[PDB]
Structure 1
Amino acid sequence: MDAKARNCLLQHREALEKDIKTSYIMDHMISDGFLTISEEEKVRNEPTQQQRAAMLIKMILKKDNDSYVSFYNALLHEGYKDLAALLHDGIPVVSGITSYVRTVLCEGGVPQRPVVFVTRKKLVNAIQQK
């Protein structure tokens, strides 16, 4: 997640660990698709409420922008008004060449095409066929 969001979590971690009853948060996050069952089992395995909260936050710190939002929403939805307020200012913005293209092809797979190039279609098409 964005550094703003992550630092907001880090700043308020102790408050969050003291109060969060994970059983009312993990459900939402699982429903939303941003927490896995195995993470939840790892959380459940901690013996005390604060230890579970601590584990869950550990996990969340490593997740993406959507996850932070999932977490925040669940907090708000479950009546943790004060805790959500702490996390409010840290909420991150969420949600031919296309997304796919720069997604997969930035893996080192290709050097970027030059600054100036004419397009030779006739050959490229052939290569695509073969």
Structure 2
Amino acid sequence: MDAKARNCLLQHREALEKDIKTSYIMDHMISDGFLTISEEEKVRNEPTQQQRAAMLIKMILKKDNDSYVSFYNALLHEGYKDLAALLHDGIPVVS
């Protein structure tokens, strides 16, 4: 993805991991077609939600620009307003 996108993620990946719950976000990204079932199970299989978030984010970082917007929309749609706000800097399109 874009430099600013990938970097915006990295800049806030810690605050994200410390708060976000992956299941609802993966439901969105799966529906959007930006996350696969296998990828989803690798994330779900993680022992703690911080690692699941960490794995998701790890995956999204190697993804295209549309996945950055899918993750951003999911966060908003799921109530993670402040964290979506922090990522607005990185590219946000759609909402």
**Alignment RMSD (CA, Å):** 1.3
Whether the 8 Å contact between 2:44 and 2:52 is mirrored in structure 1 is yes
Whether the 8 Å contact between 1:29 and 1:71 is mirrored in structure 2 is yes
For the residues of structure 2 that align with 1:48 and 1:93, how far apart are their CA atoms? 31
For the residues of structure 1 that align with 2:90 and 2:70, how far apart are their CA atoms? 13
Query: What are the ranges of 5 or more consecutive residues in structure 1 without an aligned counterpart?
Result: 95-130
TM-score (norm 2): 0.95
Whether the 8 Å contact between 1:65 and 1:92 is mirrored in structure 2 is no
Whether the 8 Å contact between 1:25 and 1:74 is mirrored in structure 2 is yes
1:21–1:93 Cα change, 3 Å:
closer
Post-superposition, which runs of at least 4 consecutive aligned residues in structure 1 deviate over 2 A?
A: none
Whether the 8 Å contact between 2:72 and 2:92 is mirrored in structure 1 is no
Whether the 8 Å contact between 1:4 and 1:90 is mirrored in structure 2 is yes
| Corresponding residue of 1:75 | 75
TM-score (norm 1): 0.70
1:80–1:92 Cα change, 3 Å:
closer
Task: Report how many residues are paired.
Answer: 94
Q: Specify which structure has the higher proportion of helix.
A: 2
For the residues of structure 2 that align with 1:73 and 1:84, how far apart are their CA atoms? 8
How far the C-alpha of 1:47 sits from its partner, in A, is 1.0
Whether the 8 Å contact between 2:18 and 2:50 is mirrored in structure 1 is yes
Q: Deviations over 1:60-106 (max 9, x none)?
A: 00000000000000000001011000100101669xxxxxxxxxxxx
